[PDB]
Structure formats: C-alpha cells, structure tokens
C-alpha cells in the first residue's frame, strides 16, 4: 500500500494563485471548466507537473491555450494527470481543463454529489480532485472565482463561497450565478450547492467594527421550519468568538445549508458551511432533546473553524489536530458557557475515557499528530479530535484565562492568511508561558510530546500526613505503556488541578492549585494542613490520563458527597463502580471457568448506596449529575480495564450490580420520577426555537434514566407510567417509552404507535430506528430483519444505515453472541456499504476495534470476519488500510 510520511513534507514546485471555475449542472452530467493561474515556486527543479484528478473524464487540456494531447504531452491514469516537464512553462502560466463528472451517481458523498434533490460538494480531505484537477493539498492556497449554471426550475438557489457578484439568465430555461471568495484558501474549503432551497435569515452586527453580516440558513422546503435553532446557535457562536477571543466574521454573508446525505456532522467551507441535516435541523415537536445540544455544538464548531482552520489553515494533513483539536476545544468552551450545566464537561470526559481510551489501547493507537497514513480520511479520529482537544485545553489550564488569551492571540495574528503547524501553536503558547512565569528561560519543549507520543498516561498517587507538622504530601507517578509507536515512552508535562477536602466537615482546605508534573515522578508537599485531608485530584479532568487515586471507597464516598468539583465527584463514583465491577466480574468468571456449583459475590457497598440516595433526594443537587451517578460506567470504559473479556460475564456483572442497588433504591427512584414530572415536562419555551433550558432537559434525562431502571426492575405497576409517558409532547419521553417497554408485552403496540408518530419526518424516523436498534429485546435479531425489510430497505442514506446498525452493536449481550452472528451481520453490512461509500463502511467497523481485548473465542470470530472483509475483491483503500492496521498487518 502507498504510504505518506510526516517527515517527508516538502513545499511544492508550483503555485496556484487563482482558480476560475464554471460548473454546468445537467441531468445526466456536470461539466467543470477550470482555469488555474499558476507559477513556478522557488523550490522548483524542473519536475513534471502532476495534478490529482480522480475519476474525471477529460474533454480538454491546455496550457497557455496550447492544446495538450494524451500520450504526447500528458498521461492520465484516473488518479494523477502528469504533464511532462518539457511542456511546463518556466514562469506564470494558465492551465485550462474541462472535465465531465456525475453527481447523480456519486454515492460516496465525496466531491460533487446529489443528496435527494440538492447538488452538493464535500471536498475535505481529498474530495476536490474528484471535481477537477488540482494539486490537492492544503498548502496550495488560492483565490476562487466560481460560476454555477443549472436548470432554473430544479435549481433556483445557487451558492458558492464568498460574495455573489452576478446572476443571469441563460437560454433553454437555465440560469447562472457567480461567486468571488476574496480570502486565499486551500481547495478542501471549496463548496458549491444547487437546489430548491428555502431559508431563514437575519442580520448580525459585529461587535468591534460594526460590520453588517447577513446570516442565511437553508434547507429543503419540507423542513424549513426546523432551521430556527441553528440560526440562533450561529448568532451565539459569533457573539462568543467576539466576547472570548475578540474575533469577528470576515465576509458580508454566511450561509449554513442542511443536506440529507452526509458522511459526517458538518463542514466549515468558507462562508458556506454544509451540514448533515441531523446536526442542523430540529423542532421541539419532532426532535429529541439531544438534537439541541448537537446542533449547538456543530454550528459552533464550524463557525469556530473560520479562524482555527480557515484564516489560519494547515501546512499539511499531519497537522490536522491543529485545526480539529483546537476547534473542539473552542466549541467546548462555547458549549460550557451556553449550557451552564456541569454535564457538558462530563459528557466530553465520558466520551474520551470510553471511546478515545479504547482507541489508544488498540492496534489503531496513534499520536494526535500521526507519523504516516494511506487514506487521510482514516485519521479523522477521536484521538485527533478528542484527545487533541484535551491537549489544547491543557494550555488553558497551565496558563489561566488571561495568558491563554494572550498566547492564542499571538498564534492567530502571526499566522493569519497562512498555513501553520503544531509547533507554531506551541511556540505561541510558550511566549505566553514565559510572560506568565516572568522568565524568558521557561520553555514548553516537553509539551511537544503530547503531539508525538501515543497512548494514554497512567497517573498514580500515594499520600502522607504528618499531624505534628500539619504537613501533607502527594507523591505522583506517570507511566505510559510502550506500543508500536514508541518502544520507550517519555514523561509528559501533566497539569494536575487539585484541592484538599477536610473529611470531618467536607470543606475546602487550600486555594485551588495546579501541580506541574514534568518528571516520571515527583512529590508535592503542602504546609498548614490542619487535619489529614482527602485529595481532590485532576479537577475538571485536567489531563487526558488514567487516574489511579489510591483512595478507599470511604474516602471516595466523602468526595462524592462533599467535593466542589463535579468531575472529581463523578470520578470518585466511577472508581467505586469499577472496583465493584472488576471484583464481581472476577467472581463470576472464576465460577464459570471452574464450573462451580455455588460461589459468593461481593455485595455493592451499602454506604455508597446511602450516598446515592442522599444525592438523589437533595432538591438542590443537579439533575444531570444525578443521571450519571445511577448509571454504571459505559461498557467501552469498563473494557479498558479488562483483558480477555468475557462479554457475557460482564453483562451478568452489570445486572447484578444494578439489581443490588435497585433492591435498595427503587422506591426512591419512583418517588423522584413522579416528583420531577411538573418541572421536567413544563411547556415553557415549547414554541420558542431560539431558547433551550438545558437544566430542564437534564431533568427529563434523569426521569428517563430512572424509568429505564424501574422498567428493567419490573417495579409494580410501572407499565402504567410507561403508557402515560408515551403521550408526552416531548419525543425524548415518548421514544423512551418505546425503549423501556422492551421488558413488557406492550412493546409491539408502542413500536407501532411511535412509528406512526415518527414516519413523516426523515430525522425523527431515524431517531425511531435507533430507539428500536438499541432496544433490550431477546428477539433483536428478528427485529433488525424487520427494519431491513420494512424501513431501511435499499437506502444509501448513511444516516439510515447508521441508525439501524450502530445502536445494536452496543448491545453487550446480543451483539457479542458467542455464535458470532452479530459479528457476521455487521461485517456483511460493512462489505455491502464499502461498495458505494468507503467512509461509512469504515465507520461501521467501529465495534471491531476492541477485538484483541476479548476472550479468545470472540477474538477468533471477529478476526475471521475481519480477514473475510479484507479478502473482498475491490475493497476500498479506506477499508483495507483500516482493517490491516487493526489486525496488526500494517
Ligand atoms: C463537527 C464535529 C462535532 C462532528 C464530527 N466529528 C468527527 O468526525 N470527529 C472524529 C470522531 C469522533 C468520534 C468517533 C469517531 C471519529 C464532524 O462532523 N467532523 C467534521 C469536522 O471536523 N467539521 O469541521 C469532519 C470534516 C471532514 C472530514 C471528517 C470530519
Ligand atoms: Mg467519473
Ligand atoms: Mg454581543
Ligand atoms: Mg430518505
Ligand atoms: Zn472540524
């Protein structure tokens, strides 16, 4: 396989200054005429001129109006167009091509494609070469003049990046529009849209310079009323970047467009952000609550790229985390500020420690700046995004808000209108660090290891207290396991945000402080500590590490109850659960392997259960926090701590633990489920798509979490509550009624009822499909066949395919059926899907990532399916690279 290496980066021998496009859309073909105004760079050594160009049909090629001919002056192999150096001018020249492409058959949703009745592009990472020839890499920055023509009745709205400078009629019922983007950009930020779109709009006045910006949000006609919240989220995003970072929008207009068929969430094309409809469109009558947080996140994320990715872009793709990690971090500050609930930060931690930690202990493990790739599309990972964001967040923790803003400003100003690397960011942060320490000898050279070193660090603690001296010490060790990226791992710069809790009264003993661990180990000593404390470690989750707190369950309970930091309270709970899960797992596993007729299980700690009740019954504690404490840790978090995992034993372990706790707390759960009703389901703002109460949404989350626990328990008469819940005006409630009815005979009537409520809204149907897919049903395989035949059918909509299959793959008991039938089903879907959408096919591989963590029979079954997929003729390069890496062949 053809491998690109980070160390091999070289600037091009060519420059592309201006791109002038005519994109002429017809029913059965699109013709793209492109003039590239080019030049020879200072790095040129008289090499061939090689363009990327994939699946293009050439009508004509010229340089300076001299026609070039295949086999004489160029060769084209369906991937690369090579102009022989003899015909490459030695100074400024115009390269002209005309090619034919076919959006109407492009089911891979990269390049130019048709999504229902909208023509749309996706160019990041290597999609522009599917539209026309280019030197298709992010340091080739240029300015774009883009004309789009089409049938006016079918395609009345035409959009491309930047200022619309002309609109005109064309004979035969056609029309055109011309766009000029005055900002230099890489080709991955090119976009075009054509469709029968409707919009909402507003005007936004920038804060410092008072520039008037027209904001448009677009969709198909049917769903125009689902655009309001997105528009409001955009205004919120613009205000945040002004308020926190001082950054203003830089064009007269910004368009957001929803399309039904999209590989990911959204895309930051300059002035023309394109979204998966599931991450732009919502209405309160037709969407679950989580759609509102999702849209707020994705709109924000794309908006924040306008600086972190667009105005300062990437030198090369190995720098991806510089824009994605930093944009995730920006979006997280934005979301925490807009929601003002502790669950926003916890949800990010939850995601990282489950999905990203599993990735980092898998054969796919990579540093946030990879050393190599085959398909760049495989490096759009939770490691690059989520670990990346935590690395970018550590700078804020180390510097504090004031100096963080200073360093960010240095970065954004110095590199504006240009490419940048991860070193450029670290250098800006180092400047701020020197100012903060007041010491121009301070440096962040060590910090670079967060970019280059793979794996999750393990941080462990030992404590000592001397009562006579009133002096307390925290001794800290860090360890990262050797792996295929580094056989010797080096110590990182780990910022450890700490407090100290007095166990006797539950109060804070020190001003909060950040310990700067830079060695393999260090001891931090505190004076005037008046009683032996309980340490509150890694507040806010201050570095992306495995924490070994070395606390007893008695100490962890006291943090759970009395600590100020939501993360440490939640982590203390997590650790109590993990200790219990590991113990019970081992007990069940030994009894299974030894074929025992009888054995013991270690009960759940009774003081812990009491602490859960005390928290739940506290009217002034947070509803969102509560839903986290009654839930066990996610399965992917749990698996990071077990080798040779028997999934069936783990499923038995979880059930025992949940049952122990419910046998004590179910009456409390029921009483809270009833008492939360009035506030949770209050209809204030139910007609206001500009405002969401995130606290109230957390109350609904908690009710629905409680209802699941009570349903699984068969609590007396709970079916009655389930039927009532099915009449709620909130889809979050009435789809939960479906999910929780799985434990009762009523399941098929609620399946019909909710289907009928969901079936006329494309996105609500997809949420229904997920609700069915993750239903705790013994007959789930027969239900999936019914979905396939009655609803999914032959859809190529990635959202439909992902809705049916991915929730099911999280069913620990059924997906990991010891027959292998779960593995076989998902592998067939992957292979089926790979024949038209390689990106989506790789996304569907995600359940296989943990294969080498499983018991040996399940390893063998998964491995057999992976090798079967690898033997598929014409397997994409995406899927092949992914599977070869995952199976330790690459
Ligand atoms: C916008 C973001 C909140 C959602 C999503 N993120 C990921 O795909 N994250 C990586 C990941 C996370 C979890 C599991 C697996 C992967 C996504 O749509 N990414 C885009 C992107 O970065 N748009 O700016 C984008 C644009 C272009 C190509 C890819 C992705
Ligand atoms: Mg083609
Ligand atoms: Mg404002
Ligand atoms: Mg559809
Ligand atoms: Zn992004």
What does 642-653 look like in DSSP terms, one character per residue?
-SSB-HHHHHHH
Ligand 1 atom closest to Cα of 328?
3
Ramachandran sector of residue 210 (left: φ over 0; alpha: ψ -120 to 50; beta: rest): left
Ramachandran sector of residue 717 (left: φ over 0; alpha: ψ -120 to 50; beta: rest): left
**In the structure encoding, which two tokens stand for residue 585, read together?**
């797992």
**In the structure encoding, which two tokens stand for residue 776, read together?**
């705790």
CATH 3.40.50.720 corresponds to the domain 11-197: no
Q: Is 423 annotated as a binding residue?
A: no
Task: Give yes or no for a contact between 866 and 823, defined as CB atoms under 8 angstroms apart.
Answer: no
Residues 659, 603: Cα–Cα separation, whole Å: 11
Q: Is 265 annotated as a binding residue?
A: yes
Closest CA to 217 of 159, 297, 291, 285: 159
Task: Give yes or no for a contact between 612 and 630, defined as CB atoms under 8 angstroms apart.
Answer: yes
**Regarding beta strands 272-276 and 372-373, do their DSSP bridges make them parallel or antiparallel, or are they unpaired?**
unpaired
Angle (deg, nearest 10), helices 762-773 and 747-758: 160
Question: Is 243 exposed, middle or buried (CB count within 10 Å of its CB: 0-12, 13-18, 19+)?
Answer: exposed
Count the Cβ atoms, other than its own, within 10 Å of residue 495.
20
Q: Does the C-beta of 305 come closer than 6 Å to ligand 1?
A: yes
R_g over Cα of the chain: 28
Q: Does the C-beta of 302 come closer than 6 Å to ligand 1?
A: yes
Closest CA to 143 of 167, 124, 162, 127: 162
Question: 258-283 burial, b if ≥16 CB within 10 A, otherwise e?
Answer: bbbbbbbbbbbbbbbbbbbbbbbbbb
Q: Which of 272, 335, 380 to mutate to test the pocket of ligand 1 (most atoms within 8 A of CB)?
A: 380
Going by alpha carbons, the residue nearest to atom 6 of ligand 1 is: 265
**In the structure encoding, which two tokens stand for residue 886, read together?**
């995952």
**Alpha helices (H) along 676-797:** 677-680, 694-712, 718-725, 731-740, 747-758, 762-773, 780-787
Residues 638, 641: Cα–Cα separation, whole Å: 6
Residues 203, 736: Cα–Cα separation, whole Å: 39
Task: Give yes or no for a contact between 550 and 461, defined as CB atoms under 8 angstroms apart.
Answer: yes
Cα dist. 608→505, 573, 653 in Å? 18, 9, 17
Sheet strands (E) in 41-103: 49-52, 57-63, 66-67, 74-76, 80-83, 93-101
Going by alpha carbons, the residue nearest to atom 28 of ligand 1 is: 124
Query: Which method resolved this structure?
Result: X-ray
3-state secondary structure of 383: helix
Question: Looking up tokens 């945040």, which residue turns up?
Answer: 240
SS3 content of the chain, % helix, strand, coil (to 5): 45, 20, 35
Q: Is 301 annotated as a binding residue?
A: yes
Closest CA to 309 of 404, 400, 462, 418: 418
| Residues β-bridged to residue 192 | 160
Residues 382, 369: Cα–Cα separation, whole Å: 12
Closest CA to 266 of 298, 295, 291, 292: 298
Task: Give yes or no for a contact between 757 and 765, defined as CB atoms under 8 angstroms apart.
Answer: no
Sheet strands (E) in 381-470: 418-420, 458-466
Residues 275, 266: Cα–Cα separation, whole Å: 4
Q: CATH number of the domain at 455-550, please? A: 2.60.40.1840
Annotated catalytic residue within 302, 555, 846, 865 = 302
**Regarding beta strands 418-420 and 312-314, do their DSSP bridges make them parallel or antiparallel, or are they unpaired?**
parallel
Torsions phi, psi for 74 (to 5 deg): -150, 165
Residues 384, 368: Cα–Cα separation, whole Å: 5
Positions of CATH 1.25.50.10 in the chain: 551-890
Positions of CATH 2.60.40.1730 in the chain: 11-197
858-861: which pairs have CB atoms within 8 A and are 24 or more residues apart? 858/647, 858/816, 858/818, 861/820, 861/823
Going by alpha carbons, the residue nearest to atom 12 of ligand 1 is: 382
3-state secondary structure of 837: coil
Going by alpha carbons, the residue nearest to atom 24 of ligand 1 is: 267
CB-based neighbours (< 5 A) of ligand 4, an ion: 797
Q: CATH number of the domain at 551-890, please? A: 1.25.50.10
Q: Does the C-beta of 298 come closer than 6 Å to ligand 1?
A: yes
**Regarding beta strands 74-76 and 66-67, do their DSSP bridges make them parallel or antiparallel, or are they unpaired?**
unpaired
Cα dist. 1→372, 849, 878, 880, 885 in Å? 12, 21, 11, 9, 12
**In the structure encoding, which two tokens stand for residue 626, read together?**
């509560």
Host H or E run for residue 231: helix 228-240
**Alpha helices (H) along 493-631:** 553-562, 566-593, 606-617, 623-629
| Residues β-bridged to residue 35 | 20, 96
| Residues β-bridged to residue 70 | 74
Residues 517, 524: Cα–Cα separation, whole Å: 9
Cα dist. 63→36, 81, 540, 824 in Å? 10, 13, 58, 53
Torsions phi, psi for 550 (to 5 deg): 55, 30
Fold exhibited by the domain 198-283: Zincin-like (3.30.2010)
Ligand 1 atom closest to Cα of 266?
18
Q: Active site includes 587?
A: no
Positions of CATH 1.10.390.10 in the chain: 284-454
Question: 342-370 burial, b if ≥16 CB within 10 A, otherwise e?
Answer: bbbbbbbbbbbbbbbbbbbbbbbbbbbbb
Residues 732, 712: Cα–Cα separation, whole Å: 18
Q: Provide the CA 882 distance to its chain's centre, in angstroms.
A: 18
Closest CA to 24 of 32, 14, 15: 32
Positions of CATH 3.30.2010.30 in the chain: 198-283
Residues 650, 637: Cα–Cα separation, whole Å: 12
Question: Looking up tokens 């009740």, which residue turns up?
Answer: 613
Ramachandran sector of residue 884 (left: φ over 0; alpha: ψ -120 to 50; beta: rest): alpha
Host H or E run for residue 393: helix 388-414
Residues 697, 4: Cα–Cα separation, whole Å: 46
Helices (H) and strands (E) in the chain, counts: 28, 31
Give the DSSP letter string of 497-524: EEEEE-TTT--B-S--EEEEE-SSEEEE
Residues 738, 775: Cα–Cα separation, whole Å: 8
Q: Is 268 annotated as a binding residue?
A: yes
Resolution (Å units):
2.0
**Alpha helices (H) along 746-855:** 747-758, 762-773, 780-787, 798-809, 812-815, 821-834, 838-843
Closest CA to 136 of 26, 34, 239: 34
Residues 360, 709: Cα–Cα separation, whole Å: 32
Cα dist. 283→313, 630, 680, 692 in Å? 35, 30, 18, 11
**In the structure encoding, which two tokens stand for residue 863, read together?**
């491995």
Residues in contact with 216: Cβ distance below 8 Å, sequence separation at least 6, in sequence order: 199, 200, 201, 253, 254, 255, 256
**Regarding beta strands 174-185 and 111-115, do their DSSP bridges make them parallel or antiparallel, or are they unpaired?**
unpaired
Closest CA to 68 of 145, 133, 135, 137: 133
Q: CATH number of the domain at 284-454, please? A: 1.10.390.10
């Amino acid at each position: 396989p053809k491998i690109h290496y980070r160390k091999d980066y070289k600037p091009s021998g060519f420059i592309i200054n201006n791109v002038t496009l005519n994109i002429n859309i017809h029913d059965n073909e699109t013709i793209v005429r492109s003039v590239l105004d080019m030049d020879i760079s200072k790095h040129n050594v008289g090499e061939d001129l090689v363009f990327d160009g994939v699946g293009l049909k050439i009508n004509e090629i010229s340089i300076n109006n001299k026609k070039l001919v295949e086999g004489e002056e160029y060769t084209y192999d369906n991937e690369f167009l090579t102009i022989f150096s003899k015909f490459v001018p030695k100074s400024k020249f115009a390269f002209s091509s005309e090619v034919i492409i076919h959006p109407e058959t492009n089911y891979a949703l990269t390049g130019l494609y048709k999504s229902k009745n909208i023509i749309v592009s996706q160019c990041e990472a290597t999609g522009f070469r599917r539209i026309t020839f280019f030197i298709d890499r992010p340091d080739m920055m240029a300015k774009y003049d883009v004309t789009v023509t089409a049938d006016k009745e079918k395609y009345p709205v035409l959009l491309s990046n930047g200022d619309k400078v002309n609109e005109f009629e064309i004979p035969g019922g056609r029309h055109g529009a011309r766009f000029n983007d005055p900002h230099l950009k890489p080709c991955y930020l090119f976009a075009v849209v054509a469709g029968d779109l409707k919009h909402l709009s507003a005007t936004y006045i920038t804060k410092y310079t008072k520039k008037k910006v027209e904001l448009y949000v677009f969709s198909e006609e049917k769903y125009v009323s689902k655009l309001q919240w997105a528009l409001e989220c955009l205004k919120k995003s613009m205000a945040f970047d002004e308020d926190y970072f001082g950054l203003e929008y830089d064009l007269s207009r910004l368009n957001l467009v929803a399309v039904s068929d999209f590989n990911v969430g959204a895309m930051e094309n300059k002035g023309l952000n394109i979204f998966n409809a599931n991450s732009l469109l919502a209405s309160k009558k037709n969407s679950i609550d989580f759609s509102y947080a999702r849209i707020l996140t994705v709109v924000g994320h794309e908006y924040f790229h306008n600086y972190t990715g667009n105005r300062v872009t990437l030198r090369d793709w190995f720098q991806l985390t510089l824009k994605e990690g930093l944009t995730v971090h920006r979006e997280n500050l934005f979301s925490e500020e807009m929601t003002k609930t502790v669950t926003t930060r916890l949800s990010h931690v939850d995601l990282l420690r489950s999905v990203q930690f599993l990735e980092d202990s898998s054969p796919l493990s990579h540093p946030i700046r990879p050393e190599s790739y085959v398909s760049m599309e495989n490096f759009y990972t939770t490691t690059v995004y989520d670990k990346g964001s935590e690395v970018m967040r550590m700078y804020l923790t180390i510097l504090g808000e004031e100096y963080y803003k200073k360093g960010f400003d240095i970065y954004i100003k110095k590199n504006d209108g240009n490419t940048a690397t991860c070193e450029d960011f670290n250098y800006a942060m180092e400047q701020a660090y020197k100012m903060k320490k007041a010491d121009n000898s301070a440096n962040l050279n060590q910090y670079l290891l967060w970019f280059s070193q793979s794996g999750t660090p393990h941080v462990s603690f030992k404590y000592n207290y001397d009562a006579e001296k009133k002096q307390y010490s925290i001794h800290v060790n860090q360890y990262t396991k050797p792996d295929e990226n580094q056989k010797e791992k080096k110590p990182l710069f780990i910022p450890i945000s700490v407090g100290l809790i007095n166990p006797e009264n539950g109060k804070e003993m020190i001003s909060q402080t950040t310990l700067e661990l830079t060695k393999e180990s260090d001891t931090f000593v505190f004076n005037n500590i008046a009683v032996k404390p309980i340490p509150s470690l890694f507040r806010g989750f201050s570095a992306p590490v495995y924490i070994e707190d070395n606390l007893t369950d008695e100490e962890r309970i006291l943090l759970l109850k009395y600590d100020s930091d939501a993360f440490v309270r939640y982590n203390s709970c997590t650790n109590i659960y993990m200790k219990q899960i590991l113990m019970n797992y081992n007990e069940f596993l030994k009894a299974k392997n030894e074929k025992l007729e009888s054995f013991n299980l270690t009960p759940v700690n009774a003081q812990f259960i009491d602490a859960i009740k005390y928290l739940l019954e506290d009217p002034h504690a947070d509803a969102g926090f509560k839903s986290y404490i009654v839930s066990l840790p996610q399965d992917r978090y749990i698996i990071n701590f077990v080798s040779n995992l028997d999934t069936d034993v783990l499923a038995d372990t979880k059930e025992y633990i949940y049952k122990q706790i419910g046998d004590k707390l179910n009456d409390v759960y029921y009483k809270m489920f009833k008492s939360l009703e009035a506030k949770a389901d209050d209809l204030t703002y139910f007609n206001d798509e500009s405002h969401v109460d995130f606290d109230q949404m957390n109350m609904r989350t908690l009710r629905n979490t409680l209802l699941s626990l009570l349903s699984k328990a068969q609590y007396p008469n709970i079916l009655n509550e389930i039927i009532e819940h099915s009449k709620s005006p909130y889809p979050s409630n009435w789809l939960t009624s479906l999910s929780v009815s799985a434990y009762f005979d009523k399941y098929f009537e609620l399946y019909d009822k909710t289907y009928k409520l969901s079936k006329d809204d494309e996105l609500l149907l997809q949420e229904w499909l997920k609700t069915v897919s993750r239903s705790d049903r013994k007959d789930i395989y027969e239900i999936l066949k019914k979905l396939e035949n009655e609803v999914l059918k032959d859809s190529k909509n990635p959202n439909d395919i992902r809705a049916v299959y991915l929730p099911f793959t999280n069913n620990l008991r059924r997906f990991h059926d010891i027959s292998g039938k779960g593995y076989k089903l998902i592998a067939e879907v992957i292979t089926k899907t790979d024949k038209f959408n390689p990106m989506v096919a790789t996304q569907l591989c995600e359940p296989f990532k943990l294969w080498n963590k499983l018991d040996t029979k399940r390893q063998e079954l998964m491995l057999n399916e992976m090798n079967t997929m690898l033997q598929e003729p014409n397997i994409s390069n995406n899927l092949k690279e992914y599977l070869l890496r995952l199976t330790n062949k690459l």
